[PDB]
Amino acid sequence: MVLSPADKTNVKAAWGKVGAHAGEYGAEALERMFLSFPTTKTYFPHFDLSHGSAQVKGHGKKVADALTNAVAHVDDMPNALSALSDLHAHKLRVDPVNFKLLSHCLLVTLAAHLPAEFTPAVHASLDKFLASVSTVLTSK
Amino acid sequence: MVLSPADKTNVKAAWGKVGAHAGEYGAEALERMFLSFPTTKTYFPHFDLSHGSAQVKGHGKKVADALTNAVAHVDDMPNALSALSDLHAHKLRVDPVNFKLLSHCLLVTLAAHLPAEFTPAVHASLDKFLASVSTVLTSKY
Amino acid sequence: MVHLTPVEKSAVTALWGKVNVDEVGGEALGRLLVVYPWTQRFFESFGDLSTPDAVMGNPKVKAHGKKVLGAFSDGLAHLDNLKGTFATLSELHCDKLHVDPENFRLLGNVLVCVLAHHFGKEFTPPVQAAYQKVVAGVANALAHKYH
Amino acid sequence: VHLTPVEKSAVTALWGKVNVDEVGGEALGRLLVVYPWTQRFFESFGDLSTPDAVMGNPKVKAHGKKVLGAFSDGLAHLDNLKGTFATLSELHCDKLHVDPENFRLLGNVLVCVLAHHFGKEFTPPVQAAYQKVVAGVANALAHKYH
Ligand code: HEM
Ligand code: HEM
Ligand code: HEM
Ligand code: HEM
């Protein structure tokens, strides 16, 4: 997308209260994705995707930290995520629907931990953000 | 979509061959859309939408020039298109599916007129471009 | 669809019994309007919709919100066929309203985001999965006479 | 979405001139070039690494012909696309897990290929007729999800 200054703050604030819960939320969001949309598992063939699994956990953390670094470089995401882009778009060839699937599950995950800060405005701002991240990661 | 250097070269090169035919190509693309996808006509509830129409053909050149202007500022687009962002996203509230439709119709137009430029590589380049244009016109910033 | 297992069928009504059928409808639709601003073109008859709190505060959105849940609860009743249950509604939304069917998916996602906002960790991943099956079948039903 | 009698005629009039050895493989090829994530379904097909390699790929062109066929098949059976594509639907959704948006993408690349091939003669109302076809095909190929 193209983030409004109001988006940029709301996203840093909202993803500011995740803090140490990054690997928990990212673990939840993945599991939510894998259950709700089982096709997504197809990209993790030899993975242990069980509840509480160590791999979903470790991977959950890797997801969440990428986002934390994204929010940081929000004005320059394509440069910041250029390694991840080649991975998800050139090596892994992930179908764009899957990014919609995971962004929804992160959004659902945040709604269920941050009941206070997850207002209509911040929800919208987070949506734009995750869309923007999805855009970068789907292109070479 | 972020438009590689290769993309930027391919769009300029194939949008150049448009040139004088800007209004012609633009008019046709809007027409292709209006007929292929009836639901899009309602964003122009006061337009004369008949074949050849002075409104259609006149509007299509504005599209083509906003695009020429977009090609001119590929690296600086959300500012070059700041007006159109509020026009289409804020005020007109256009469903983003439509930009997919017009970009397509634009592509189909360009494939009809420039059959030597429309290599698969350029097709791809033009797609990422049009969809980049569309992303800006559907953003509130 | 896909089907909802008996456990999924039992986890869903349980949660759906705690949701205020008179206030959470306007909560879902309201966020659809603010999260996805282009959908505000379908509800121009509803007066002020220029700011988040206004859209949430606009009374007609609230009142029209209840009708939404109406249809959804109605669809919860008969997972037998959402297609038939939403035949009337499909024709209204599709042929007469020209609402792009992707917006169906979005409402069913905002709804799910809204359920998650109320019920915290009671909205577990398996409860989410079950609901995703419901908002999918419903969005698919509504878009049946485009097929 | 049901073509008109003059739409149906323009449709078959144009399709009857379509080089069935080429077009299918040019559309699938451009799908692969324009939408590179679709390559994931085709690791078996060999070199898909550059546009030219994709376009010149013998497996792309070959398989493309089978694509065109099912389309042609649907062009004759416009009144029941559901059953006509019922097996391919089963195939693309449950074994292949292709997301239904890609069916719509491919249909639109076929329309782009047609425009490339028949220039002016791929007129706006002809395109509209074809849009109703590829939509119907894409809808039929996704009936599995329904
Ligand atoms: C906001 C969206 C996403 C973010 C921020 C993200 C971020 C990441 C990160 C940080 C890694 C670590 C790998 C590395 O650094 O080498 C990774 C790997 C990976 N991602 Fe994601 N990703 C996203 C979306 C997706 C989606 C939607 C899918 C598929 C459903 C996906 C599939 C994969 C796969 C298959 C790997 C490699 C697995 C392995 O290690 O074997 N990604 N991604
Ligand atoms: C490549 C994509 C697009 C470009 C470059 C573009 C550009 C433009 C331009 C240059 C104008 C002229 C504004 C003026 O001078 O008054 C305009 C107006 C307008 N645009 Fe487009 N636009 C695009 C997509 C769309 C789509 C897909 C729709 C709806 C189907 C749309 C709806 C409108 C409407 C309703 C107006 C004003 C018409 C009126 O006066 O009522 N735009 N746009
Ligand atoms: C996906 C789930 C949806 C459900 C269950 C649903 C259900 C309903 C119901 C029950 C009504 C009331 C009909 C009446 O009272 O005559 C209605 C009306 C309406 N719907 Fe929704 N619908 C859905 C999706 C959408 C979406 C996504 C939009 C727009 C973005 C939309 C736009 C409208 C409009 C404009 C009306 C009539 C407004 C009025 O009467 O003033 N629908 N729908
Ligand atoms: C949009 C209309 C489409 C049509 C008419 C179509 C038609 C066909 C046909 C006729 C076959 C041959 C199956 C067999 O011989 O048993 C096939 C297989 C296949 N389809 Fe397509 N398809 C479409 C869309 C897509 C898309 C968009 C993708 C990928 C993004 C896809 C992925 C595949 C794959 C991987 C195969 C089998 C290749 C192999 O077995 O090596 N399909 N389809």
Test mutation, C32, C35, C36, chain A, max A CBs within 10 A: C35
Report how far residue D131's alpha carbon sits from residue B57's, in angstroms, rounded to the nearest whole number.
22
Query: Is-cis flag, bond preceding C2, omega within 30?
Result: yes
Tokens of D32: 């692969």
Report how far residue C119's alpha carbon sits from residue A112's, in angstroms, rounded to the nearest whole number.
7
Distance in Å, alpha carbon of B10 to nearest chain A alpha carbon:
16
The alpha carbon of B87 and the centre of ligand 3 are apart by a number of angstroms equal to 26
Test mutation, D2, D103, D145, D146, chain C, max C CBs within 10 A: D146
Tell me which chains share at least 3 CB pairs under 8 Å with chain B: A, C, D
DSSP codes of every residue in B20-74: GGHHHHHHHHHHHHHHH-GGGGGGSTTS--STT-HHHHHHHHHHHHHHHHHHHTT
Which of C55, C66, C89, C98 is the best mutation target for the ligand 3 pocket, counting ligand atoms within 8 Å of the beta carbon and taking the most? C89
Tokens of C71: 């249809």
Q: A121: helix, coil or strand?
A: helix
Tokens of D36: 């590179």
Domain that holds residue A62: 1-140
> Which amino acid is residue C7, in one-letter code?
V
Report how far residue C108's alpha carbon sits from residue C85's, in angstroms, rounded to the nearest whole number.
16
Residue list for the binding site of B for heme b: 88
The torsion defined by the Cα of B132, A83, A81 and A117, in degrees rounded to 10, comes to 120
A 10 A CB-CB count for C43 gives 17
Nearest to B4 among A1, A136, A140 (CB): A140
Three-state DSSP string of A27-86: HHHHHHHHHHCHHHHHHCCCCCCCCCCHHHHHHHHHHHHHHHHHHHCCCCHHHHCHHHHH
CA-based nearest residue in chain C for residue B140: C37
Find the distance separating the first CA and the last CA of chain D, reported in whole Å: 17
Ligand 2: does its nearest atom lie under 6 Å from the Cβ of B102?
yes
How far is residue A29 CA from its own chain's centroid? 8
Give me the half-sphere count of Cα atoms (radius 13 Å) on the Cβ side of residue C120: 6
C35 touches chain D (CB under 8 A): no
Q: Are C1 and C137 in contact (CB under 8 A)?
A: yes
Question: What are the strands, taking DSSP E only, across chain C?
Answer: none
Q: What is the phi-psi region of residue D19: left when phi exceeds 0, alpha when psi lies from -120 to 50, beta otherwise? A: beta
Write out chain C residues lying below 8 Å of B141, CB-based: none
Quote the number of domains for chain A.
1
Residues 6+ apart with CB under 8 A from C37: B89, B90, B93, B140
Report how far residue A98's alpha carbon sits from residue C36's, in angstroms, rounded to the nearest whole number.
19
Report how far residue A57's alpha carbon sits from residue A45's, in angstroms, rounded to the nearest whole number.
16
Which of D67, D72, D110, D113 is the best mutation target for the ligand 4 pocket, counting ligand atoms within 8 Å of the beta carbon and taking the most? D67
A 10 A CB-CB count for B93 gives 17
How far is residue B51 CA from its own chain's centroid? 19
Q: Which of D120, D23, D129, D131 is nearest to B109 (CA)?
A: D120
Q: C130: helix, coil or strand?
A: helix
The 10 Å CB-count burial string (b at 16+, else e) for D91-112 is ebbeeeebbbbbbbbbbbbbbb
According to the entry, how was the structure determined? X-ray
Cα radius of gyration (chain D) = 15
The alpha carbon of B64 and the centre of ligand 2 are apart by a number of angstroms equal to 10
Name the residue with the closest Cα to ligand 2, atom 20. B88
Helix (H) or strand (E) holding C127: helix C125-142
Report how far residue A8's alpha carbon sits from residue A17's, in angstroms, rounded to the nearest whole number.
15
Report DSSP state, residue D79: T
Report how far residue A100's alpha carbon sits from residue B120's, in angstroms, rounded to the nearest whole number.
27
Q: A117: helix, coil or strand?
A: coil
Report DSSP state, residue A93: -
Report how far residue C77's alpha carbon sits from residue C64's, in angstroms, rounded to the nearest whole number.
20
> Cβ–Cβ of C37/B93 closer than 8 Å?
yes
Report how far residue D68's alpha carbon sits from residue D15's, in angstroms, rounded to the nearest whole number.
10
Q: C80: helix, coil or strand?
A: coil
Q: Which of D141, D143, D134 is nearest to D105 (CA)?
A: D134
Report how far residue D146's alpha carbon sits from residue D143's, in angstroms, rounded to the nearest whole number.
5
Nearest to D124 among B28, B104, B121 (CB): B28
C30 burial level (CB within 10 Å; 0-12, 13-18, 19+)? buried
Phi then psi for C143, rounded to 5 degrees? -105, 30
Report how far residue A106's alpha carbon sits from residue A111's, in angstroms, rounded to the nearest whole number.
9
A 10 A CB-CB count for D16 gives 9
Helix (H) or strand (E) holding D108: helix D101-117
Write out chain A residues lying below 8 Å of B141, CB-based: 2-5, 7
Report how far residue C143's alpha carbon sits from residue C140's, in angstroms, rounded to the nearest whole number.
5
Report how far residue B141's alpha carbon sits from residue D65's, in angstroms, rounded to the nearest whole number.
46
A 10 A CB-CB count for D58 gives 11
Q: Are C38 and B95 in contact (CB under 8 A)?
A: yes
Angle at CA D138, nearest 5°, toward C2 and A90? Answer: 85
Q: Are C52 and A120 in contact (CB under 8 A)?
A: yes
Q: Is the dihedral of CA B107, B113, B114, B116 positive or negative?
A: positive
How far is residue C143 CA from its own chain's centroid? 14
B112 touches chain D (CB under 8 A): yes
Q: B18: helix, coil or strand?
A: coil
Q: Which of D34, D31, D58, D33 is nearest to D44 (CA)?
A: D58
Report DSSP state, residue B128: H
Using N-to-C axis directions, what is the helix angle for D124-141 and D5-15, rounded to 10°? 90
Q: Is the dihedral of CA A106, A112, A118, A119 positive or negative?
A: positive
Find the distance separating the first CA and the last CA of chain A, reported in whole Å: 17
Q: Are A128 and A1 in contact (CB under 8 A)?
A: yes
Tokens of C110: 């905002």
